[PDB]
Amino acid sequence: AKSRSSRAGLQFPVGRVHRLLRKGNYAERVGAGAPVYLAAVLEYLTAEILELAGNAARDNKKTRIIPRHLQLAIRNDEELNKLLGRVTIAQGGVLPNIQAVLLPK
Amino acid sequence: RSRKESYSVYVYKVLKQVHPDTGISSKAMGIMNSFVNDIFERIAGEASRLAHYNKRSTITSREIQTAVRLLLPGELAKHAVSEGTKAVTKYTSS
């Protein structure tokens, strides 16, 4: 009648995030609000990253988040670069930066 | 149908709140799909090990919160904890 996710004012799936918890041999007992918490955190990280990448792409005169700007949003943020430090976003290239020594004049 | 489920319906529902007019390419949507499977397993594995530390046989929301504290850099952790605790608070009243 009402998805467990909706009963948190969220957009993310509290119901399937519960199943992924109590099927992956993490523990033996997923509480009432363990998936309600994990789903909230996942949706939060998604909100952050999606906003950054989206109007980084719209900074590029785009109306469609492209993975290049996913990489830009992640690599410019000091918190998301620590989190996704050892993650290589495919087809995201690198960040523009020229070492002063190389640069002329 | 079923076959292969994914996050696509929630990466686009949450993207339509931050930027109502911005879309997402299939490749970038796939990248977001992959990214969420990273954090889910990271937080859940650290929470399973946390339950194993205090010798509980259950992953509660307390375990998940302490696993969120261990991974997010300060401000990120301080806002993710607030998100999770507000969701749990509002879900217990309904």
């Binding site: 909100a47 952050e48 906003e51 109007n55 980084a56 719209r58 900074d59 943020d77 | 709140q17 401000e75």
Partner: peptide, 27 residues
């Protein structure tokens, strides 16, 4: 939500300003 980190909210504001300046030139 619209409850992001203050630096991220300021980046959104700065992006709106950057877009408005870019259009102020291009238009």
């Amino acid at each position: 939500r619209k409850s992001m980190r203050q630096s991220t909210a300021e980046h959104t504001r700065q992006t709106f300003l950057r877009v408005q300046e870019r259009q102020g030139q291009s238009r």
